[PDB]
Amino acid sequence: HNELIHDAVLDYYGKRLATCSSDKTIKIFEVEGETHKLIDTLTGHEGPVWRVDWAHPKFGTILASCSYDGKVLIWKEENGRWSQIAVHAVHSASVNSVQWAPHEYGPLLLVASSDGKVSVVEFKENGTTSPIIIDAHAIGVNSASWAPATIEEDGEHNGTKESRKFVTGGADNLVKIWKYNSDAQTYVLESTLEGHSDWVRDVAWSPTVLLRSYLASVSQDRTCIIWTQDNEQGPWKKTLLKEEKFPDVLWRASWSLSGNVLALSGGDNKVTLWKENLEGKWEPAG
Amino acid sequence: MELSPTYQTERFTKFSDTLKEFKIEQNNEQNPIDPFNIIREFRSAAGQLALDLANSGDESNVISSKDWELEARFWHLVELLLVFRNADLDLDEMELHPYNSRGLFEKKLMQDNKQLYQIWIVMVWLKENTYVMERPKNVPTSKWLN
C-alpha cells in the first residue's frame, strides 16, 4: 500500500485516524489498531504531507492539513463527504505544523511557517478573523503545538495575562513559550532556552503536571532536553533525558494522555519509552 | 446599610424635619403649599446622611454611605418624572414639511410620545454618573517608521 508512514494521528472519539503520507494524500482511515478501513482519500496538495490534525469537539471534526504548498487547506465532511471549507495563505514558505487549540483556548488555528513567522487566527462559519501574527525564531518554525492549559486572572476581569500560550521551535536552536500581552505590541517573548546545537525538530507539552511543566524539545543533535519549569511558573531548568548522543536520529517525541511516559521515535525504527528514574534524570522503561 | 445607634437618631430627625417644614407651609401665610417641595427636601437629606456616615471613620458606615448616595440619587430621578407627569404634555410645535432636516422630525416625535421623553431623562441620569474614559492603555511601539 504505502511503503512509508511518516506520521499519523487520531480524532477525539478514537474511531478515525488520519495518515500523513508523502504522495500528497491524506488517507482517512478508521482505527482498528494495525488494520484500518480506508474510507476516504484527499489528494490535493503539493509535496510531502508534513502534518494534519483533528479539531476538539465543540468546533467540528474539522481536519486542517499542511503540505509543502505553504497553505492550510482545511477539509470538512459536509454531507457525509469531504470537501474544502477553507483556505489560508497569509504565510507561504511551507507550513510545517497545523494544530487545533484546547477547548477553552477556542477554535484557534496554529500556523507555523519556515519564514520565521507564525499566524494565529480563528475558525468562523460567518467568516472574519483579524490577522494577528507574531514572529517566532528567524530561520523557521519546524513544529508548533499548543500551550498546556488556560490560566485564571482573578480580580474583576479574567483572562488578562498569560492565557493562550504558544510554544514554537525554530531551526536556530531556540525553544520558548509566550504570554499573550495586550499592553506591549507584539507578544512579549519570555526566555530564550538555548541548549541546542542543531535544529529543533518536535515540541510537546505534557497534559500531565504535578509541580512542574515538562516540555520535550527534540533536536537533531540526538538528545531530547526536558524543560522542567521548577514550580510551573519558575525558571526553566536543564533536565536531561539522556546526557549522551543516542545513535538514533529522533523525530517526534509525544507524551501520553496520563502519566509522564514519553515515546521517542529512534532512527533505527525503535520507539524507546522513557520514565523518570530514581533521581531527577530519565532512564528507559523500554 | 449598617445602622449605628448615633446616626439612626439623625436619620429620623432630618426626615422628620422635612415633614415639619411641609406643615409649616400650610399654616404660613407667605409660603405656597406644593407637594413637590417634600420630595426635594428628602433628596438633600438622604445625601447629607451618607456624608455623615463616611465622616465617622468607621469602615462599616462607609459601606452605608454608598447605599445612602444611591437613595439620594433615586430621589432626584423621582422628582423629575413626577414633575413631568403633572406638568408638561406637549413641546413647542415644529414644522411638518417633508423638505425639513432630520432634526425637526426628531423633535416632533418627542411631542407625541411622552414615554420616550421619560426614557431619555433616565438615560441622561445614567450617563452623568458614568465617566468618560482616560488616556489609551496601549499606544504604538513605534510602528510604520520600521
Strands A237-240 and A253-255, by their bridges, are unpaired
Residues of B whose CB is below 8 A from A186: 141
| B113, three cell numbers | 410620545
Q: Strands across the sheet with A117-122, in order?
A: A95-100, A108-113, A117-122, A132-135
Count of structural domains, chain A: 1
The backbone torsions φ and ψ at residue A216, rounded to the nearest 5 degrees and listed phi first, read -95, 110
State the nearest Cα–Cα gap between A136 and chain B, in angstroms: 18
Q: Strands across the sheet with A141-144, in order?
A: A141-144, A168-170, A175-176
Q: Which CATH number do you get for residue A22?
A: 2.130.10.10
C-alpha gyration radius of chain B = 23
CB neighbours of A261 closer than 8 A, spacing ≥ 6? A255, A273, A274, A275, A285
Q: Within an 8 Å CB–CB cutoff, is residue B146 touching chain A? A: no
The rounded distance, in Å, linking the Cα atoms of A188 and B141 is: 12
Technique employed here was: cryo-EM
Q: How far is CA A172 from CA A138, A219, A223, in A?
A: 7, 11, 16
Kindly determine whether residue B141 and residue A182, on different chains, have CB atoms separated by under 8 Å. no
Q: What residue numbers bound the domain in which A214 lies?
A: 3-286
| Identity of the amino acid at B65 | S
| A264, three cell numbers | 521517542
Secondary structure class of B89 (helix, strand, coil): coil
Secondary structure class of A132 (helix, strand, coil): strand
Q: Strands across the sheet with A253-255, in order?
A: A253-255, A262-266, A270-276, A282-284
Q: Which residue has the cell 439612626?
A: B8
DSSP B144: S
CA atoms within 13 A on the CB side of B64: 23
State the nearest Cα–Cα gap between A184 and chain B, in angstroms: 7
- Give the CA dihedral A54, A57, A59, A61, nearest 10 degrees: 40
The rounded distance, in Å, linking the Cα atoms of B85 and A233 is: 63
Q: Which residue has the cell 531548568?
A: A237
Give, for A60, the enclosing helix (H) or strand (E): none
CA atoms within 13 A on the CB side of A92: 8
| Identity of the amino acid at B48 | Q
Q: Within an 8 Å CB–CB cutoff, is residue A184 touching chain B? A: yes
Smallest CA-to-CA distance from A204 within A194, A213, A217, A193 is with A217
The rounded distance, in Å, linking the Cα atoms of A275 and A282 is: 6
Contact A228, A244 (CB under 8 A): no
Kindly determine whether residue A182 and residue B143, on different chains, have CB atoms separated by under 8 Å. no
CA B7, chain centre distance (Å): 24
Q: Within an 8 Å CB–CB cutoff, is residue B141 touching chain A? A: yes
Smallest CA-to-CA distance from A263 within A79, B37, A255 is with A255
